[PDB]
Amino acid sequence: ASPFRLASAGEISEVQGILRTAGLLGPEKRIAYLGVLDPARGAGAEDRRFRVFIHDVSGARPQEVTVSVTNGTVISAVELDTAATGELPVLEEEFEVVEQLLATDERWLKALAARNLDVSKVRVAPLSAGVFEYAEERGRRILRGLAFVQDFPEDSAWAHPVDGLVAYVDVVSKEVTRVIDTGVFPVPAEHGNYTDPELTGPLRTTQKPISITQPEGPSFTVTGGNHIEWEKWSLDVGFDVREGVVLHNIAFRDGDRLRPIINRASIAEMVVPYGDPSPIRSWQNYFDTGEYLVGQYANSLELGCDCLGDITYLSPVISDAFGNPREIRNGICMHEEDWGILAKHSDLWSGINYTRRNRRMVISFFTTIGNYDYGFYWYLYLDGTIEFEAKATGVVFTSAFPEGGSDNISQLAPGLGAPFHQHIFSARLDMAIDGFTNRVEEEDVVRQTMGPGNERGNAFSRKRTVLTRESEAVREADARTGRTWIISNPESKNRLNEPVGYKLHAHNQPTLLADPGSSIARRAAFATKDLWVTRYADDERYPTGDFVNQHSGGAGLPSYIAQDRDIDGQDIVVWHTFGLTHFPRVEDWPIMPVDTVGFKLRPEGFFDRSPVLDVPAN
């Protein structure tokens, strides 16, 4: 029975039972985070452990707690000084509180009355507060509110932002701390109702069906709930409330032996920094993963439209605020799809014409964080390639469009603006290239001068620089010189006596644009550089640390690498920053078509020849 299996409803209840029995889950206690821990290095006696962050609604300090569900014990339980180490993740029950409190606040009511807005119609987005100049906030759970008018129950409030107005609220003490009204801006009037026949026009009747079926079922097998076997690949599909879909034990069956490639793959953080210097939004940065927990808002995916073809679903189970299990029904899609030509050659000399088709295994989920929706897709290809893709859609976050324009906002509709922002991901790749003794090299293309040894000036080459210690493993992209990073195992050689390896190909999109002195440059330090390599430690899980909410700099990647540990042939972890810089366009409105970003890794001398020679003709 696999120690990487998904959490069951029964294990969550049992964690609830253990915490209760131990006096840790009283009626004022709320579970802000609950996840199964990964087995320790060299673990394979089953010991299923769970980590829990417990919040207290009476204002008592929260606790970080580690439970062992196999033995029914509490391993550890420590009280957190949230002013030092960070507030716990935002709770779903707090979302509604910001609006609720504000409705009876004289300063808010006065703001709304000045704009002739009915309070019953004003929705309020509960946004993370971050850390800025407000000393009273240190140690308190604050959310900031931005207002959107909803004309009727099924109206898109995003069409009607209320600019010039923002409020700060304490969700534990249930007080409004501040209401800032910098002045009235017109509230945009056009609606953004993309199911309304008057905006859509008559729907298209021209789309004929595309049917994708597998009459013998899929080529992959699921065993033990979440262990996948597919075209030589094997892995375990995990799910965590914070990270979402996590991949464990990525390995490839090369002949007789199962060869490990990646021990653990996840999206360990994502940040959405806004680039509008208005005080109404200049504080706005979302850590969807770290502050909000993208996994808990995973959608239930419907058949025939979210995932198309012969789909196998997992329904991962998470804890609600009280420790009861709730299943995200059909939260994870798994299927295989055709991927065009894999390899082809029509040889004149031999007379042999050869064509083989490609395919990929797809493991995905989709999450919704207020106006934003994100699809997270992992792909495994026949040829050994591993890819991640993020798909960004939803409704763009809106503001007023100033009269006379803006260098930091674009116009979507009359008076309607969309502040510039980025969406930036950190992929945490706990490498295991033919096992754990790994090293990373930076590879650049090398141009050569015409002269002795190169008289026609056609030569070009490449170079590789080993990253030997964490202090020299914070790297930036260089698209111009074709920079990639190769993860190799210096003690496992292919038949040509070269170290086996995988090469990471980035998209070389811009990294974090904020000024390096900014609060966000410190809280999202990871996002300022494209590639980090650390020595593995079981407590270095996120590039932003364990508690991101209103937590200043001081944890996460920059503190991990300060240890300057040896990474030249050790158990190492690759953290790749990648993101989209979004200047919104009128085509993004009223609902945004998908835009994508990602990366991939391809074998680099890993195999002894092509690993797809045994793929049959179609």
Place this chain on the structure above:
Amino acid sequence: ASPFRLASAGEISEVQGILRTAGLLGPEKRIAYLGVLDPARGAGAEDRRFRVFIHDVSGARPQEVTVSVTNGTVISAVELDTAATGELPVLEEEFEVVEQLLATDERWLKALAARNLDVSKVRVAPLSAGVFEYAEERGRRILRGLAFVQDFPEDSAWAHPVDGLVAYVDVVSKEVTRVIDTGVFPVPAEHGNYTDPELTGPLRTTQKPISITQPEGPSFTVTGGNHIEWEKWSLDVGFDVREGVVLHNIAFRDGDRLRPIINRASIAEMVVPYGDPSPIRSWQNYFDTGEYLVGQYANSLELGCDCLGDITYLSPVISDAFGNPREIRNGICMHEEDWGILAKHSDLWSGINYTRRNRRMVISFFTTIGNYDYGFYWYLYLDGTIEFEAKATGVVFTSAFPEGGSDNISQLAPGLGAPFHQHIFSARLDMAIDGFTNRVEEEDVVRQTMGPGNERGNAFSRKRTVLTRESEAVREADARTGRTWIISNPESKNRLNEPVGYKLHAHNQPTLLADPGSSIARRAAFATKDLWVTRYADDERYPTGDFVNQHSGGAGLPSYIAQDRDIDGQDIVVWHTFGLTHFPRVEDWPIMPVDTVGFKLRPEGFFDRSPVLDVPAN
């Protein structure tokens, strides 16, 4: 009847008839190139014209000839000084000549005898000669030969390169001009026969079928032979023996009006420079498009494995060496395919959950140039996006692997090497954004310093620089600052009073690595920079000029832009360089899995809101 329709078998015969009748196609004459010309600006009285390059096997000078097939006349016919303006494209009948001549040459036979190679088993690759230090070559049709051993009729000769040996041959006079033997290298012995059960092992039985059907047929219509209508898109699919699939009249039906986007889209050149400084290969650069004509080697694509699903094929017709028509049966695939989620949002406030699926129209062909095979794919998406993708596969070009290694060659198998090289494309995009009055801006992300106006240091912006004249329109990539280029129409404004536009997103791969003083840097000047913009002229068709074969610098892009013409609101042409830098890997051997490169253009304020609001639920 459409003036952009494909050439018919009858038109080619009739060109043959006109040339014959006019005394231009005698029995010593050979057609090296024949294609239909595009209508002139403002043409829509039908005048189908054809351009022809006629070679003479008796050593007489070739002719460039323009014929009008509608009227049955010769419009023009001029004699070429090939030493000045370039040799004609390599003829298919010349491929075999290099081996044939060399078989009875004492210097070649002596080279082969020194290596104990049987001449009956030595295949010779007829490679373009380019232009280097050999004065006798100027004005003569030369090919260079590199030798590969084929052990039996169905062996892969590429496995057995004969290094240290190269020969130069005149295919008109039928003489061997030179044989260079720099010394024996071991001939690699392992075979590269990817259909041999001993190399493949038992074939996989694990792949279950994927069936892609359309029970009502496809959503696109074909009329007039090659006019496509699909989900608001309309275009004409052309085919030229040099460029292959060319797209004409790309337009989008936005409500009532058919809005042009791109007038003509093609791959106007592709170059494959080799980076091994050995004199055996340092001359090696292939212009697949310009020297060899990729269209004439287009494969016949088989159903259920080259193109999968409900496919509509075109079978374009080309001229053979004598002016007879030959059809490339099923040479062009056209189909539509699913492309995941198009847009999605689950709104808390409204309670509305919304999901729409994407799809794309695919127009492709596949060509084979000796060891290389390339797939050329154009995609049209529901949301207005236009994409090109090149898929590179085939067998890698081989050499010996030196003992003691190499900075310019990688090892694939014992003693077997693969010289470093690039594959670089030029896409020629004759822009028509809402018509022909267009302009191009370079857009960079702009970082802002924390200070007055930006006290939190979160602001970021962008800037756009109009490229006003050809002298300032030769641009390079800058991935770090998110550089793109926007093609706009300054006189067509969207509802927000902004110029309509499309944004070109490049991959920012390395451009030509050869030393700027190199012969290849001059012949492939286009490849040294990522983006060029020229004022349209009907005679500026290729970035390398009309005659690339053994033609030095002096034509193509650098000479076009010297005219320094106005491109600020004019009929303009975008030439985008993009390519792959290939350091071959053991996984590429014995047959290479597909690797991809490309680009795309997305609407940028072109539409008044999302153009896919009328897409129905699934």
